Write a structure and sequence with these properties.
Two copies of one chain form a homodimer.
Chain A lengths: L3 H4 L20 H13 L2 E6 L2 E6 L2 H10 L26 H11 L5 H5 L2 H4 L2 H15 L3 E2 H17 L11 H6 L4 H5 L8 H8 L9 H4 L9 H31 L1 H14 L8 H4 L3 H13 L5 E5 L4 E3 L2 E3 L4 E5 H4 L43 H16 L2 E5 L22 E6 L1
Parallel strand pairs in A: 2-7
Antiparallel strand pairs in A: 1-2, 3-9, 4-7, 5-6, 8-9
Helix pairs in contact in A: 7-8, 7-18, 8-13, 13-14, 13-16, 13-18
The complex binds protoporphyrin IX containing FE (2 copies) and the ligand O=C(NCCCc1cccnc1)[C@@H](Cc1ccccc1)SC[C@H](Cc1ccccc1)NS(=O)(=O)c1ccccc1 (2 copies).
PDB class: oxidoreductase/inhibitor
Keywords: cytochrome P450, CYP3A4, inhibitor, complex, oxidoreductase, OXIDOREDUCTASE-INHIBITOR complex
Assembly: dimeric
Chain lengths: ~425, ~425
């Protein structure tokens, strides 16, 4: 099974028995793909244990997989287990089960449903400023992801269910070499999500908007244990992703103060006298969008986009056998000098309307693409921008003595910083 | 997972944890289905371990699964492992891999390719008579399956490769309760077919008609390790199935002597002076066909026909969820008094042209139905009839003191007799 890429004439690192190429993950997914992208070029292959993974970097080939041949060949991602009842989660579901869930949950982030959330979100931002105004007086370093995650959790519980609360690898290493053990753990009720975290919610969702828009579309319809599984996906997505990217954004503004002031100038221009950010004023701030896009270029929290080839195909002149996991190294593409001038530098001017057109939307894919892209892309941009407006309207951010500069990425599994992002906060 | 049939309102025996209903297999598949068919009626369900199995007995519902909705919903059988390289076997392959193999191997049993085999098969029948003429003088009991299997092996090695040779459960119980262990054994090279039997052939096929018609259609084509896997399927199919049914036929002729004489009378009528059976004279003997069909009714070696439901459907007014193994109890249907008068009695007159029309071809399915039926159905009927003609032309068969009457079926896994079939042979 380890000769599939030698057979197909596809270059790649030499795999070891059983382990495949997993030992190369010692520097993390990001550094591995960046090297592989430089070592072999447009297309290479490797083996996650016994699982062959093909990495494509051709924009036409990427557009073919994510968009053109999604409903037919590349519908589902890499299988993930043990999941239990979470198999019905939309990010985990497959084939016709996914198409039904994606349609049922797609009217949750329409342009109208998001506009109803701006008056609701506008509450915890003041809780966010007032929670940040107390550490301000304390005159000391601040952990951003804590006060951001506390804010982000307040938004996700209310935008989907409406609960108001003031919010104040070790084992997956064996999953990839033992994917045959995944069916074993599914019959033991073993779950990668600890069974006490889910049991805290296997009744809490029954113990309770997105929650409204599910039973209303239940009345070939929606179940109830699956309703809990979608809540878990949304609750995690709105918490961790929003807080993590906001931590990355405030770090870049602190280490690049000129961008922070020019951002504060536009915020006070569209919203004078510290005006409350509305839906229409958020989409007007283009420099805010440029700061958001550039930070997502340097830190695409997903790193990779993956699809399982479900039958033999010959896309863009290359045969791909059945079962191969097609992977797009998003972190590697976002830092390729063959597309980005001085790629390691934070430059929001890449996304100005003077330069936003020299950017392939199949190289810069922080939210994926095609029918399986990030379903909450428009909410996440809105939720973060409403948070950046209300915070930068009141505070400036400076690095501290303990601030990690340059920021070391987590050499581990998911895209996070090694040391938590701490900065000094000053009141305007 | 054990409440799927309570949810759907489908009757069936109460399953035990983990085991499901496998403890009911203590009398064999046949007695279990016969009781279930009487206990619940037209449709029931049970659990092979954790695998839900739905048993249908409605001819329209059976025709819908085997024929009408084969290419779409019920393409593949129950997954079988560990198989190794035998996953590419046509009886084991799935989806588009199977459709390619079924088309590539379908021109092997055409009406013309079989007609070329009659002059070749006509050799070992004389080896069969001469091997039976020696025990004749010995004047003692004879094991039919030995001299039939020796004959059947001579035919299968020459009709497909042309090699001339004078040919003179314990562990699957854990497969069904541990289907999660099947992926484990696939990575250990563990095989339900002992690796020394296959290694005896992983080179013997390379160390060597059906074999011709494979490389000629190779020239999206056919491989080589897969060529060996198809040889193993054919070599077993032509040996065990032919020898086993021939053992059943000669037993029924011995315990019903009037049928044996009336059969010998027609053989000498179409072929006077002990004429060599040709292709056209075999299809003329209708009483020979009636004896073959009736024995296959009492002993359908497959017992069951199974299909895996690959997506949600509502066939003939009944919803069937994704993943359910749809099973047709062939042994149970062949003995249902609601279709057969005095079902336990051997009566070839059921298949006379006066009565062959009061028989539903979706109740009597000894070779399956639809695009996935027995690919070697026409060869097996021809191979057996050429053997029955040449043997009944020279010998009569009487029961012995050690002959098992009534014949006890193997209470185990596959449809065989408990004691081997032994009879006395006399020369005409
Ligand atoms: C900065 C914030 C976020 C980023 C960068 C992000 C990024 C992504 C990416 C790259 C994918 C995979 C796309 C693909 O495979 O083609 C994805 C999928 C997904 N995202 Fe997000 N996401 C963010 C926030 C959110 C939020 C707030 C939600 C709220 C529900 C969410 C829900 C989902 C879901 C359910 C999927 C699975 C899509 C499917 O399987 O149909 N994400 N996201
Ligand atoms: C008395 C003799 C035989 C009987 C009663 C018999 C019966 C059957 C049955 C019931 C099936 C399954 C049909 C279904 O699932 O719908 C089958 C499949 C099959 N049979 Fe036979 N068979 C016999 C002899 C043979 C012979 C001589 C061959 C020679 C190659 C053969 C090759 C196959 C194959 C390859 C399949 C798998 C079909 C597929 O997956 O496409 N059989 N047979
Ligand atoms: O549902 C999951 N996540 C998406 C939900 C939240 C989210 C995150 C980021 C962007 N938008 C939304 C994963 C299981 C999970 C985790 C925490 C809470 C609940 C469930 S499992 C499927 C992934 C696909 C995937 C990957 C990346 C982004 C989106 C979707 N595939 S993955 O390779 O195994 C993997 C490995 C390590 C971390 C994350 C995912
Ligand atoms: O290829 C196999 N057999 C068919 C080949 C010969 C044959 C037999 C009868 C009729 N025509 C042809 C099985 C594996 C095998 C066995 C011996 C040698 C080589 C390979 S494995 C798929 C079966 C489907 C199936 C069942 C019954 C009849 C035809 C096809 N499915 S099964 O439920 O697991 C099972 C369980 C116990 C015994 C047999 C099969």
């Amino acid at each position: 099974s380890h000769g599939l890429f030698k057979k197909l004439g596809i270059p790649g690192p030499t795999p070891l028995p059983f382990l495949g190429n997993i030992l190369s993950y010692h520097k993390g997914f990001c550094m591995f793909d960046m090297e592989c992208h430089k070592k072999y070029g447009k297309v290479w292959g490797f083996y996650d244990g016994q699982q062959p993974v093909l990495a494509i970097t051709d924009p036409d080939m990427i557009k073919t997989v994510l968009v053109k041949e999604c409903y037919s060949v590349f519908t589902n991602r890499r299988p993930f287990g043990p999941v239990g009842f979470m198999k019905s989660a939309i990010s985990i579901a497959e084939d016709e089960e996914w198409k039904r869930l994606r349609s049922l949950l797609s009217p949750t982030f329409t342009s109208g449903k998001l506009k109803e959330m701006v008056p609701i979100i506008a509450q915890y931002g003041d809780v966010l400023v007032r929670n940040l105004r107390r550490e301000a007086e304390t005159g000391k370093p601040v952990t951003l992801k804590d006060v951001f995650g506390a804010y982000s959790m307040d938004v996700i519980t209310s935008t989907s269910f409406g609960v108001n609360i003031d919010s104040l690898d070790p084992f997956f290493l064996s999953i990839t070499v033992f994917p045959f053990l995944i069916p074993i753990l599914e019959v033991l009720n073993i779950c990668v999500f600890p069974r006490e975290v889910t049991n805290f919610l296997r009744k809490s969702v029954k113990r309770m908007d997105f929650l409204q828009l599910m039973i209303d579309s239940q009345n070939k319809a929606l179940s109830d244990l699956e309703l809990v599984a979608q809540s878990i996906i949304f609750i995690f997505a709105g918490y961790e992703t929003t807080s993590s990217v906001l931590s990355f954004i405030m770090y870049e503004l602190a280490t690049h103060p000129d961008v922070q002031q020019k951002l504060q100038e536009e915020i006070d221009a569209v919203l004078p006298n510290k005006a409350p950010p509305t839906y229409d004023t958020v989409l007007q701030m283009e420099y805010l969008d440029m700061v958001v896009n550039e930070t997502l270029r340097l830190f695409p929290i997903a790193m990779r986009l993956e699809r399982v080839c479900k039958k033999d195909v010959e896309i863009n002149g290359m045969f791909i056998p059945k079962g191969v996991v097609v992977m797009i190294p998003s972190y590697a593409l976002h830092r390729d000098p063959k597309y980005w001038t001085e790629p390691e530098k934070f430059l929001p001017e890449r996304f100005s309307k003077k330069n936003k057109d020299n950017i392939d939307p199949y190289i810069y894919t922080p939210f994926g693409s095609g029918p399986r892209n990030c379903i909450g892309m428009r909410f996440a941009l809105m939720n973060m921008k409403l948070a950046l407006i209300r915070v930068l309207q009141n505070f400036s951010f400076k690095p501290c003595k303990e601030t990690q500069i340059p920021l070391k990425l987590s050499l581990g599994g998911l895209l996070q910083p090694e040391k938590p992002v701490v900065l000094k906060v000053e009141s305007r």
